């Protein structure tokens, strides 16, 4: 049991974008299907929902500014009018909130809302080093600078190593553009040998780079 | 508010017990329409509980739901490395009143431990572009505060930098953080020692790591 989202991403203050979600392993017809979003940082927070019938039901805040349809197949959320304060996360859910049903979720689609232009990244290499380096274990990473909008993915060796990576959080720079760093441990003995690559994957560009991070020739 | 949910945070070590509380203005529907759920970083959130105790499938029966009417419980029992998560209760009040609590952060105690301390000078690549980044990292530490401080030449650097915080390591129960200071290639190259301080409960004394630019 699955549902899929799609029809996220940029838009424009006071424009309008539509979400929807599909369904896989179960006939979404059969089920109400709620839509909570979740702001930067912040709780869950139900909008509305929607009957077998096509009959909407909305939280207080939310009615006007919110429209719930369905299909046979679909179920999908119309943002009208949206400020920055409606950039969030947003979900489908089977059921209501509180309901046995809504055991399957969508994975959520970011909506944000801004006036300013996607930009893919700029991927730098964190090389490993002097400064770099403790008891035999040194850190290396991938600088991914200045894109818009969120997100990005960030793998390495193409999802061969895994363990000991961390992939940060991304920032907002006073630039209005996003930043992250992800960094990986290895073996500062193994620095010579082994090739350690970070894949970045911005989707909203359709931006991948391929950044193979080695220590600097000094 | 409809759904009153506290504290904002509980903590317990491997092996506890937390409990999470959630009152609603009113009687939720059937005396029982109330549910949990568990969120970590990236992901929507998992469905634990509904109908009050009724455990959703896959989920271990060390997660127990109680309560009635408007005063509902979620008792963790063998608190596991991988509980280190956002969780939520959410009701049905009846009217079409579906509402979340505000959250419970849970946050797995562990033995303190020092952050391992990184410091990377700006790629040749970027400065050709005019800017220059200088990233410290603060490696698999516990507890989550840590302070860093940014070095040039002995200057002390002051909001040119910012700073981001992974969640709980769902394993070893540790976090990181990552530091970078921006500076112009003018500014970078005019300058040789770059410095990162980190203060921290695990360190009886501030680490730092520092390179002088350019030397290999």
């Known amino acids: 049991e699955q549902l899929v989202e799609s029809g996220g991403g940029l838009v424009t203050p006071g424009g309008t974008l539509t979400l929807t979600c599909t369904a896989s392993?179960?006939?979404?017809?059969?089920?109400?299907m709620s839509w909570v979003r979740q702001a930067p940082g912040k709780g869950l927070e139900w909008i509305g929902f929607i009957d077998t019938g096509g009959s909407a039901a909305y939280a207080p805040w939310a009615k006007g500014r919110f429209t719930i349809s369905r299909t046979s197949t679909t179920v999908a959320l119309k943002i009208t009018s949206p400020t920055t304060e409606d950039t969030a996360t947003y979900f489908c859910?089977?059921?209501?909130?509180?309901?046995?049903?809504?055991?399957?979720w969508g994975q959520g689609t970011l909506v944000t809302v801004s006036s300013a232009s996607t930009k893919g990244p700029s991927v730098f290499p964190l090389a490993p080093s002097s400064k770099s380096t403790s008891g035999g274990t040194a850190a290396l990473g991938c600088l991914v600078k200045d894109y818009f909008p969120e997100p990005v993915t960030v793998s390495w060796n193409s999802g061969a190593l895994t363990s000991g990576v961390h992939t940060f959080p991304a920032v907002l720079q006073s630039s209005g553009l996003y930043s992250l760093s992800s960094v990986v441990t290895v073996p500062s003995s193994s620095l010579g040998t082994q090739t350690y690559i970070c894949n970045v994957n911005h989707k909203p560009s359709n931006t991948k780079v391929d950044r193979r991070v080695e220590p600097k020739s000094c | 508010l409809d759904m009153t949910q506290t504290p904002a945070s509980v903590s317990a070590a491997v092996g506890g017990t937390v409990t999470i509380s959630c009152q609603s203005s009113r009687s939720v529907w059937n005396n029982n329409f109330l549910s949990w759920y568990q969120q970590k970083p990236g992901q929507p959130p998992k469905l634990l509980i509904s109908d009050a105790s009724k455990l959703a499938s896959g989920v271990p029966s060390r997660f127990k739901g109680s309560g009635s009417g408007t005063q509902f419980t979620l008792t963790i029992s063998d608190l596991e490395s991988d509980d280190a998560a956002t969780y939520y209760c959410a009701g049905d009040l009846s009217d079409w009143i579906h509402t979340f609590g505000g959250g419970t952060e849970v946050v797995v105690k562990r033995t303190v431990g020092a952050p391992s301390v990184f410091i990377f000078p700006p790629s040749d690549e970027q400065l050709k572009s005019g800017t220059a980044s200088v990233v410290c990292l603060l490696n698999n530490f516990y507890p989550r505060e840590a302070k860093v401080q940014w070095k040039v030449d002995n200057a002390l650097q002051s909001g040119n930098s910012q700073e981001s915080v992974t969640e709980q390591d769902s394993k070893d129960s540790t976090y990181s953080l990552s530091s970078t200071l921006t500076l112009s290639k003018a500014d970078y190259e005019k300058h040789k020692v770059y410095a990162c301080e980190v203060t921290h409960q695990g360190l009886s004394s501030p680490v730092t790591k520092s390179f002088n630019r350019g030397e290999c």
């Open positions: 392993g179960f006939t979404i017809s059969n089920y109400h």
């Open positions: 859910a089977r059921g209501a909130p509180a309901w046995g049903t809504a055991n399957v």
